[PDB]
Design an enzyme around this catalytic site. Structure first.
Site, short mmCIF file in Angstrom:
data_model
loop_
_atom_site.label_atom_id
_atom_site.label_comp_id
_atom_site.label_asym_id
_atom_site.label_seq_id
_atom_site.Cartn_x
_atom_site.Cartn_y
_atom_site.Cartn_z
N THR A 1 0.84 -1.24 0.00
CA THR A 1 0.00 0.00 0.00
C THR A 1 0.85 1.26 0.00
O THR A 1 1.83 1.37 0.75
CB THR A 1 -0.96 0.01 1.21
OG1 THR A 1 -2.10 -0.79 0.90
CG2 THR A 1 -1.44 1.41 1.54
N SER A 2 0.49 2.21 -0.86
CA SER A 2 1.06 3.54 -0.85
C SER A 2 -0.08 4.54 -0.75
O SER A 2 -0.93 4.60 -1.63
CB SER A 2 1.86 3.79 -2.12
OG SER A 2 2.94 2.89 -2.19
N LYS B 1 -9.05 2.67 -1.99
CA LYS B 1 -8.49 2.83 -0.66
C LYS B 1 -8.92 4.14 -0.04
O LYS B 1 -8.67 4.38 1.14
CB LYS B 1 -6.96 2.69 -0.69
CG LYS B 1 -6.49 1.27 -1.01
CD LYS B 1 -4.98 1.13 -1.02
CE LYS B 1 -4.59 -0.20 -1.65
NZ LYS B 1 -3.13 -0.46 -1.59
N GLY C 1 4.74 1.04 0.80
CA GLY C 1 5.36 1.79 -0.27
C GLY C 1 5.87 3.16 0.10
O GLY C 1 6.67 3.75 -0.62
#
Ligand SMILES: [Mg+2]
Ligand SMILES: [Mg+2]
Ligand SMILES: [Mg+2]
Ligand SMILES: [Mg+2]
Ligand SMILES: [Mg+2]
Lengths: 237, 235, 198, 250, 204, 233, 243, 196, 222
Positions: free
Chosen positions: H1-2, H33, H130
């Site tokens: 996840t970023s 997200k 990330g």
């Protein structure tokens, strides 16, 4: 309490109001950036220590409460209001808005008119302060009823107090400063005391003003109090 | 649940008073079986007889009750009695002796008589059961929680008149068929209605498995009551 | 470890139970009676964890004695064993299970037959002509599969038992200090006080 | 906060009456007429929609309720008491039966559960009995069609036909005159309509009357196809138009 | 170790033409020690048959619980529980103990007394229903049983033949399992009658 | 108006009165007199102890709550025990948690709040005792008066119990004098014994009769009874 | 008076007096309200009376925003009103959290009526002296009015009115729908539906209103909102140019 | 996840990749997200998807109840509700949340609530597996009072780098723009951002 | 297990294989993995078999009760919210992994739920040990705006990929089609590509082959 009369009334609450009427007179005045609270303290005896039976109560940092009727019932209400304000601040981080707080007390007072195992409160409470969007002043009856006020009074001197308040609303529609509203509160308490002239009294004033106290509740003491007392003594004669 | 200055339990007395208006129920114990007969509370032609049981209930395969009082109160107690019989079965791997079941039910009624501020159950039971300790047994319990054993007994309306008639004609060496007759005659004599017809009755026996060595509960279908009512000579 | 043997002959049930109580490297006692009478015609022997053993037995003894007085009647051996099984079955899933295995020998007065029940700590019940708990059964089951007959007398059964005890005295690693032998029949429960030298 | 009536509010009087149950039954008597007739291949439950205002929309308030796909109810007495009883009855059908045996309860047992709920309001502390009598009609595989009455005391009775509320005595009389054991469902519906007309003051049409049947399976009401042993609800509420259709040849 | 291995045992049920069969071994052991030669694993409530394998204490307990529950059923319902319904009652009874399960593998056999259709089912310890129409197997020789049944089974067998098949499936599966066997019992169930046969088998 | 309105503390009279509370107030007037007074340096409790018989002890009227705080009682004595124990606990909690001596004022508020809850709860009764609370905290000498209505007031001096109206008038008259008895324990006590005398139809006050207590700047709360009070008679 | 007057047990006549007395409580405020359905909106109008000139006029209100979509007008004393408002808000937020969609007007109403039924059956609870009128544009049913009383009764309305002079308004509306033959106000803008409601309140009560005499709540597709004094003033002017 | 949120001149922008993995398998390549807890209060979730959905669903419930009673909640109030849930339940939650909102008074605000349930008010925040690869890039390129277009560019470039290096990140870049003007959803496909 | 969900223009389809296993052993060669939550909301589960069935039946029971209480058709978002909240509470101990699909008054819906309580939304999904085989097919052929016909084809093909390539999956393909205006259609054994071949020999035994020790008639009656 949980008992409706044949025509929709609640006698127990109506009787609770009688305890309030029997009480010392207290008032609140809403100025252009805050609120002022004053109360009549009957001096039963010279033995009472001056300045040392404080009636006006703070809730959180920004709210003042004053009441007439059964004093202990009022303290009970303020304890609850403090738990209620802490709970709000704990979850939402912001200090409780005055209307938010009003309903908290309201719902609590109303609950005591639902059940046969409980009595309504024997007080009317005048309270308020400053929040995110200005000054608010409230009055709350034994039934749980409450509204916003421009000015409010309760207890024995209530009728004359309301008359004085009504005059101020007419002569100053354009707001009215915190410093004036303090002076005028001392006046109104003095005029309301006329009924009880057989026993001597003591004056208590508190205020919460955006510019004068930085939105915090603060007791009026020292020179500011004396100046307000002198004004009331002057204007009574 | 409080005492009177006389030393009486008001609510218990008034529950007993209410029961004396319910349809009479009769139990007779014979040497080879037990009879249970009960009068239905004055009804209508439109009542479904085929699927109606207001007075006779099965507790397990060997025990039944006849009810006098509030049916809804009785169903509550019957349900717990059924559960109690199965608990015993599960614990001991034997069918519950009749007295043990009766005692428990009577204790539940006694409780309401002593604590909790609730009203008593407006119910009297006649229990008809068999076990291998006392053979055929007949018991009675009322709202006080008192219970007693009998060779013949009645509950509900006209118990006094029904009791005298049973006392007159009962004999220890009776067969079940003789007991069937006695129960129906006694109800006929004590009825508050014109004629004791099939549609106004519930009837049951506890015999010896038709032919086996076992015990059988026969809960009479409407037709069978009509047949047995002619046989005994009341048409 | 503890020796718990049962054999059912034609007209009685015989229980034999070792006499030793051993903690660590010390035999603390050599005359321990690993038995509680539950009712005049029902006897229970027990073995397992050090405290649970007596506590469970005495708890069971209290319950059957209560029943007897309430009903003025003696429960059949089949009823007592079902009650016992259920108690153990509850125990196994409780916070701290009773770690006890039991033998129940009873004379049924209604059927006029002796009855032996073997119940382990899990609540596993079975009715058997002969039974054992622990390591002892690893020797005695086969011995009795050979020597046992369904129509034996009480005296024949005591010989059959003597044979079992002789084998355990020969082959078992621990000294169990002989057994206390009890007979349960139509006249109730009695102890044979001569077995260690009979 | 806390109850100060932890005792029974229904108690026996010196003469044996259970006052509050009697008074509840009086409330049922003042209620609008409802009735049920059992046929050979169906049951019909019917009642009048007595509206409180003509500004009200009477379709938003059903007096006839589905309890299970094969069981419906109607009442006389206090509507709000009925409404909450239906909720609890629906729920108890699931919690005490369907979640256990993976099928819906037979009519008698559900009736039995409702009766228990009403009995408890007769013995528990701090409550009044329910002010209603229910008629419950259902089908189940092993008992066929049935019709039950349940009273404020918790008593239930199986009926071939009955009526409750206002004009119940006259309607029970009209039903004894008309009922037989060879009635087809359409005949029972016809009698239900006739019996109801005597009990109805105002307009008598598919908008003022409420009627439902327990008949055969409606596969068109199931919502899905592909499982052959699932055949659809036997409970069916008749439409306004269906009612009016039968009122023309009345 | 494994609670489903302490005691040993097998149950198999099969469907045939207007009949069902349910069979079980008689072994009760404690690991390597065989204790009882007479431990039956099939029970019945009315015309509904239930086999249970696994921890024997749970076998006994579940029998007593289902006797209890079906007795109450019969009183309230005024009829005997049917195979399909009982199956559901076993499933929900097992799932109720989801996080403290009985260590058992139950098997239901019977004929619906209204439709006349033969019915069998299996369950896992937490009540997941195996709805197979040919055979259901369970116990410490379940692998051996699946093998035998998949080979031996054919549909619509006459009761006298189904008897041979179910018996042969049981015996030979039992004989490849150290913890199964020691005697065997077989039930042939017809809508009208039920015959019970004890088999002769190796006693090792 | 008094008829059907005094059955519990959960009912208001048509005047708005709580009769159970007023009746509890009446048990205080039935109690034996006790006096409290203070200067800037000390606070003194004086109490007339009462015997049941001539064969009996004279019952105690003074209870210590902490090293800097105590009270006297008039009314139901077992109620004083309940309330003083609560006060001892509040004093304790303050020391243990905050290392802080409880302000006499806060003791007042806590007692008030406790009494209040019993003037509003069904099934309970109000407290039937009045208390006079003396203490020395971070702002000096203090005297409080507790009424079981929940009203607590701070005073230079006061008296409660039978015939207490005399002692009160006396103190009201002597105000300017006794407030200034600083640094002199014995003179302040003398003025207290003086005050309780104006409340005697009883008699002479004896060595068994009299109970005195003192707290102050460098004096922990201390009770005097028996031979140790003779020098004041 | 016996126990049948003081708590909710049956009287010999099968009545519940505390319930009936609670209905009389609803009128104590001497305020009248009416609700009407538009084509794609719903409008509640209520009287606004501010007798005491020490009152802040902006805090005097009997209209409540229960959720984003549901408004509620109460006839009854404010303390009970605010109790009902708080519960309804809490019920509305909880429904949405548990079931993943917004609570329908009718369903909230049913729920509130069920709560009222309880006070009708349990001795220790008094009923609330209030009548609650719920409005919205339901995503499934369109404009909706549902009203609950102290008996636990509730139903849907084409339009409705509540208060001491309930009947005068009711019959006025009854007469309108007689003429129109439809069950709503055939009108596009909510502004014109608000005008119709104010107009028909004026006729029925025979009273003129200033901008401070009225209170207005409007529900549309996905919002319920209240009108300011000025929005109302704009409505008053609009009606007066013809009427 | 970023995931990230950035304050700018006119409000606040939230951005995220769209990849959710279990191990090396991409269970969902088009996840959203960006989560709404109020009209103009949004959050990006990181950590346990079960935990952060359960939390966000509860916050949304509280803010809806808040709005019914007390009007529009401030971003600070939202952040405080999140923190309360995360702090008080730290032993059973694996949740890192970034809160972002707009109101007329306080303009655009960003709060980050990392694992232990602390709260931090920041001009911009980054989070997720990330994020580690872009601390350098973001600290060198972020300026206060950027325009909408500049901010969208900053997030686009930042998350493309985070996606380039982190295997747990990827798919499309989603953004939510929060201003007085309203709410604007943006999406950017790999073929655009990979060529940056 | 292989289960798939595929959205199309006017609705949503779900499909599953029909193999249940106990480790390496196949217990049921033709079980049903497609469960009903309500008439138009269907469900497929992988993981602990008893858990998927139970959580489906519980939430189905409550959804029925909800529907009756509210007088409305049950919505897919309600099934999702109740499932996820229930599963979340149990922290993964209820091992239910589900694809939930349906139609309601608000349109058509496709969701995945995981045992710890997280959910997702998409146009195509797979779950089970066959999920990767199925997803490879889905990622190969899925397009936006599929007809009903194409969606059934795609879903069926995805299940086949699991049947042939995943040892955890096998036997038959079941489908359920949920179109916006219509009744849900459940298509049991929609494909049967795994018929067991005729055995080489019959194993029926001559009667008397089995040795019987003793015998008796069993009493069913009372
Ligand atoms: Mg006032
Ligand atoms: Mg195996
Ligand atoms: Mg073997
Ligand atoms: Mg009530
Ligand atoms: Mg990447």
């Amino acid at each position: 309490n949980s008992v409706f009369s044949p025509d929709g009334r609640n006698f127990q609450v109506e009787y609770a109001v009688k305890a309030v009427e029997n009480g010392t007179t207290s008032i609140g005045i809403k100025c252009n950036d805050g609120v002022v609270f004053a109360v009549e303290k009957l001096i039963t005896s010279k033995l009472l220590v001056p300045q040392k039976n404080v009636k006006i109560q703070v809730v959180d940092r920004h709210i003042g409460c004053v009441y007439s009727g059964l004093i202990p019932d009022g303290r009970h209400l303020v304890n609850r209001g403090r738990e209620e304000a802490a709970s709000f601040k704990k979850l939402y981080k912001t200090p409780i808005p005055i209307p938010a707080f009003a309903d908290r007390l309201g719902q609590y007072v109303q609950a005591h008119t639902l059940y046969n195992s409980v009595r309504p409160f024997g007080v009317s409470t005048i309270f308020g302060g400053v929040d995110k969007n200005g000054a608010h002043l409230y009055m709350l009856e034994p039934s749980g009823s409450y509204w916003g006020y421009k000015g409010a009074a309760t207890g024995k001197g209530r009728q004359s107090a309301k008359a004085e308040l009504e005059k101020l609303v007419d002569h100053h529609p354009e707001g009215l400063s915190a410093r004036e509203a303090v002076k005028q509160a001392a006046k109104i308490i003095y005029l309301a005391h006329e009924d009880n002239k057989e026993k001597d009294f003591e004056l208590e004033i508190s205020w919460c003003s955006l510019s004068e106290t930085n939105g915090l509740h603060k007791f009026v003491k020292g020179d500011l109090l004396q100046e307000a007392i002198d004004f009331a003594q002057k204007e009574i004669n | 649940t409080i005492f009177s200055p006389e030393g009486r339990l008001y609510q218990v007395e008034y529950a007993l008073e209410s029961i004396s208006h319910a349809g009479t129920a009769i139990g007779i114990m014979a040497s080879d079986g037990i009879v249970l007969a009960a009068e239905r509370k004055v009804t209508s032609t439109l009542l479904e007889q085929d699927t109606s049981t207001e007075k006779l209930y099965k507790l397990n395969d060997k025990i039944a009750v006849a009810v006098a009082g509030l049916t809804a109160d009785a169903e509550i107690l019957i349900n717990t009695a059924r559960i109690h019989a199965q608990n015993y079965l599960k614990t001991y791997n034997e069918d519950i002796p009749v007295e043990i079941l009766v005692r428990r039910l009577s204790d539940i009624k006694q409780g309401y008589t002593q604590h909790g501020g609730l009203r008593p159950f407006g119910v009297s039971f006649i229990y008809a059961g068999y076990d291998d300790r006392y053979g055929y047994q007949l018991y009675t319990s009322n709202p006080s929680g008192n219970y007693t054993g009998w060779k013949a007994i009645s509950v509900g309306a006209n118990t006094s008149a029904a009791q005298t008639l049973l006392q007159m004609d009962y004999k220890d060496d009776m067969k079940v068929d003789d007991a069937i007759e006695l129960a129906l005659k006694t109800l006929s004599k004590t009825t508050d209605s014109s004629a004791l017809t099939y549609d106004r009755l519930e009837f049951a026996t506890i015999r010896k498995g038709a032919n086996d060595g076992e015990v059988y509960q026969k809960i009479f279908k409407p037709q069978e009551i009509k047949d047995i009512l002619v046989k005994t000579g009341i048409t | 470890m503890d020796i718990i043997l049962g054999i059912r002959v034609q007209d009685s049930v015989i229980l034999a139970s070792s006499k030793a109580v051993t903690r660590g490297i010390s035999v603390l006692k050599d005359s321990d009676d690993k038995t509680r009478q539950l009712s005049p015609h029902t006897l229970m022997s027990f073995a397992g964890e050090a405290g649970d053993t007596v506590q469970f037995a005495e708890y069971i003894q209290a319950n059957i004695q209560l029943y007897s007085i309430r009903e003025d009647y003696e429960l059949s051996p089949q009823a007592v064993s079902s009650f016992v099984r259920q108690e153990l079955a509850k125990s196994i899933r409780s916070r701290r299970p009773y770690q006890v295995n039991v033998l129940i020998g009873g004379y049924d007065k209604k059927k006029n037959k002796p009855e032996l029940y073997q119940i382990d700590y899990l609540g596993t019940k079975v009715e058997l002509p002969y039974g054992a708990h622990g390591y002892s059964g690893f020797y005695t089951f086969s011995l009795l599969d050979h020597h046992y007959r369904p129509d034996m007398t009480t005296e024949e059964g005591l010989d059959l038992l003597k044979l079992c005890v002789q084998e355990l005295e020969k082959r078992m690693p621990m000294d169990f200090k002989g057994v206390i032998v009890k007979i349960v029949d139509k006249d109730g429960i009695r102890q044979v006080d001569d077995f260690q030298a009979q | 906060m806390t109850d100060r009536y932890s005792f029974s509010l229904t108690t026996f009087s010196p003469s044996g009456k259970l006052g509050q149950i009697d008074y509840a039954l009086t409330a049922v008597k003042q209620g609008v007429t409802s009735l049920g007739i059992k046929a050979t291949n169906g049951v019909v439950i019917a009642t009048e929609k007595k509206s409180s205002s003509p500004l009200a929309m009477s379709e938003t308030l059903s007096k006839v309720s589905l309890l299970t796909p094969d069981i419906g109810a109607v009442y006389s007495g206090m509507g709000p008491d009925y409404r909450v009883l239906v909720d609890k009855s629906r729920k108890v059908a699931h919690t005490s039966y369907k979640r256990i045996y993976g099928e819906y309860p037979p009519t008698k047992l559900l009736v039995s559960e409702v009766a228990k709920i009403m009995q408890e309001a007769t013995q528990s502390g701090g409550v009044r009995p329910f002010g209603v009598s229910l008629l419950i009609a259902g089908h189940d595989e092993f008992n066929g069609f049935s019709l039950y009455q349940v009273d404020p005391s918790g008593s239930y009775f199986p009926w071939k036909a009955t009526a409750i509320g206002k004009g119940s005595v006259a309607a029970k009389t009209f039903l004894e005159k008309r009922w037989n054991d060879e009635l087809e469902l359409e005949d029972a519906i016809h009698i239900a309509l006739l019996t109801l007309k005597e009990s109805v003051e105002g307009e008598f049409n598919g908008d003022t009357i409420e009627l439902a049947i327990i008949g055969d399976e409606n596969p068109d009401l199931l919502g899905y196809t592909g499982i052959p042993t699932d055949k659809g609800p036997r409970f069916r509420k008749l439409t306004s138009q269906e009612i009016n259709d039968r009122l023309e040849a009345l | 170790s494994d609670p489903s291995s302490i005691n040993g045992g097998i149950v198999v049920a099969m469907t045939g033409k207007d009949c069902v069969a349910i069979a079980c071994d008689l072994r009760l052991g404690s690991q390597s020690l065989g204790v009882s030669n007479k431990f039956e694993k099939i029970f019945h409530y009315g015309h509904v048959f239930l086999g249970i394998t696994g921890l024997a204490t749970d076998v006994t307990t579940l029998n007593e619980m289902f006797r209890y529950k079906t007795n109450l059923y019969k009183l309230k319902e005024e009829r005997a529980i049917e195979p399909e319904t009982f199956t559901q009652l076993v499933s929900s009874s097992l799932y109720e103990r989801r996080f403290g399960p009985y260590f058992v593998g139950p098997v239901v056999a019977g004929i619906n007394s209204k439709s006349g259709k033969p019915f069998i089912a299996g369950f896992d310890l937490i009540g997941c229903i195996d709805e197979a129409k040919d055979f259901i197997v369970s116990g410490t020789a379940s692998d051996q049983l699946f093998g035998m049944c998949e080979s031996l089974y054919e549909p619509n067998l006459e009761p006298e033949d189904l008897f041979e098949t179910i018996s042969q499936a049981l015996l030979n599966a039992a004989d490849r399992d150290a913890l199964s066997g020691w005697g065997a019992v077989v039930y042939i169930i017809k809508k009208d009658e039920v015959v019970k046969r004890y088999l002769k088998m190796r006693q090792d | 108006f008094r008829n059907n309105y005094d059955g519990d503390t959960v009912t208001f009279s048509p005047t708005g009165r709580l009769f159970q509370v007023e009746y509890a107030l009446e048990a205080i007037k039935q109690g034996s007199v006790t006096v409290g007074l203070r200067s800037n340096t000390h606070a003194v409790l004086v109490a007339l102890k009462r015997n049941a018989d001539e064969l009996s002890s004279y019952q105690k009227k003074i209870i210590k709550c902490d090293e800097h705080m105590g009270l006297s009682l008039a009314g139901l004595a077992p109620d004083a025990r309940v309330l003083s124990n609560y006060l001892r606990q509040q004093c304790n909690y303050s020391s243990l948690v905050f290392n802080r001596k409880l302000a006499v004022e806060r003791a007042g508020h806590l007692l008030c709040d406790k009494a209040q809850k019993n003037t509003q709860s069904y099934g309970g009764r109000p407290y039937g005792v009045g208390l006079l609370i003396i203490g020395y905290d971070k702002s000096g000498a203090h005297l409080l008066e507790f009424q079981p209505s929940g009203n607590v007031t701070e005073l230079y001096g006061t008296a409660i119990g039978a015939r207490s109206q005399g002692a009160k008038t006396y103190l009201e008259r002597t105000l300017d004098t006794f407030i200034k008895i600083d640094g002199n324990p014995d003179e302040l006590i003398k003025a207290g014994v003086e005050a309780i005398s104006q409340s005697l139809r009883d008699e002479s006050l004896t060595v068994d009769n009299l109970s005195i207590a003192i707290v102050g700047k460098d004096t922990p709360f201390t009770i005097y009874d028996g031979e140790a009070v003779a020098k004041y008679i | 008076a016996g126990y049948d007057r003081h708590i909710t047990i049956f009287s010999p006549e099968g009545r519940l007096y505390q319930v009936e007395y609670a209905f009389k409580a609803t009128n104590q405020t001497n305020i009248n309200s009416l609700a009407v359905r538009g084509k794609d909106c719903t409008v509640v109008i209520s009287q606004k009376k501010v007798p005491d000139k020490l009152l802040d006029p902006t805090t005097v209100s009997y209209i409540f925003c229960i959720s984003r979509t549901i408004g509620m007008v109460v006839n009854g004393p404010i303390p009970d009103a605010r109790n009902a408002a708080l519960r309804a808000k809490a019920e509305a937020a909880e429904f949405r959290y548990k079931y993943g969609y917004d609570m329908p007007c009718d369903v909230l109403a049913k729920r509130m009526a069920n709560l009222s039924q309880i006070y009708t059956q349990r001795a220790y609870m008094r009923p609330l002296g209030v009548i609650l009128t719920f409005v919205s544009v339901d995503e499934e049913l369109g404009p909706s009015i549902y009203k609950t009383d102290p008996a636990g009764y509730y139903v849907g309305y084409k339009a409705t009115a509540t208060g001491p002079k309930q009947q005068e308004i009711t019959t006025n509306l009854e007469n309108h729908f007689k003429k129109s033959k439809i069950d709503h106000i055939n009108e596009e803008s909510w502004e014109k539906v608000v005008e119709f409601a104010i107009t028909h309140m004026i006729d029925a009560l025979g009273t003129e209103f200033s901008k401070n005499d009225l209170e207005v709540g409007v529900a549309t597709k996905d919002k319920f909102f209240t009108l300011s004094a000025e929005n109302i003033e704009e409505r008053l002017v609009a009606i007066a140019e013809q009427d | 996840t970023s995931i990230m949120a950035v304050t700018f001149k006119d409000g606040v922008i939230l951005g995220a990749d769209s990849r959710t993995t279990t191990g090396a398998y991409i269970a969902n390549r088009v996840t959203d997200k960006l989560t709404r807890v109020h009209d103009k209060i949004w959050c990006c979730r990181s950590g346990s998807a079960a935990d952060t959905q359960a939390i966000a669903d509860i916050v949304q419930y509280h803010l809806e109840l808040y709005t019914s009673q007390y009007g529009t909640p401030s971003t600070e109030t939202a952040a405080s509700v999140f923190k309360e849930l995360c702090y008080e339940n730290k032993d059973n939650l694996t949740a890192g949340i970034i809160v972002a909102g707009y109101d007329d008074k306080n303009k655009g605000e960003v709060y980050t609530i990392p694992l232990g349930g602390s709260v931090h008010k920041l001009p911009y925040a980054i989070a997720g597996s990330g994020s580690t690869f872009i601390y350098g890039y973001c600290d060198k390129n972020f300026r206060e009072n950027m325009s909408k277009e500049e901010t969208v560019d900053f997030i686009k470039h930042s998350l493309s780098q985070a996606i380039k290096w982190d295997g747990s990140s990827g798919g499309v870049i989603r953004m939510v723009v929060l201003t007085a003007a309203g709410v604007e959803r943006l999406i950017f496909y790999p073929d655009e951002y990979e060529q940056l | 297990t292989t289960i798939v969900g595929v959205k199309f223009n006017n609705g949503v389809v779900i499909a599953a294989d029909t193999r249940s296993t106990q480790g390496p052993i196949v217990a049921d060669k033709n079980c049903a993995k497609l469960h009903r939550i309500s008439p138009k909301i269907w469900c497929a589960g992988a993981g602990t078999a008893a858990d998927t069935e139970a959580v489906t039946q519980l939430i189905g029971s409550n959804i029925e009760l909800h529907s009756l209480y509210t007088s409305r058709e049950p919505r897919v978002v309600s099934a999702l919210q109740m499932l996820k909240q229930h599963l979340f509470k149990y922290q993964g101990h209820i091992g239910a992994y589900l694809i939930v699909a349906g139609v309601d008054p608000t349109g058509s819906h496709l969701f995945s739920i995981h045992a710890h309580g997280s959910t997702d939304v998409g146009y195509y999904l797979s779950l089970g040990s066959g999920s990767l085989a199925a997803m490879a097919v889905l990622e190969s052929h899925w397009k936006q705006d599929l007809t009903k016909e194409e969606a059934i084809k795609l879903a069926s093909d995805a299940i086949q990929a699991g049947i042939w390539n995943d040892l955890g999956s096998g036997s038959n393909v079941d489908v359920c089609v949920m179109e916006i205006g219509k009744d849900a259609e459940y298509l049991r054994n929609y494909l049967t590509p795994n018929v067991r071949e005729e055995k080489q020999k019959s194993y029926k035994f001559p009667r008397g082959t089995t040795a019987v020790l003793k015998e008796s008639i069993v009493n069913i009656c009372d």
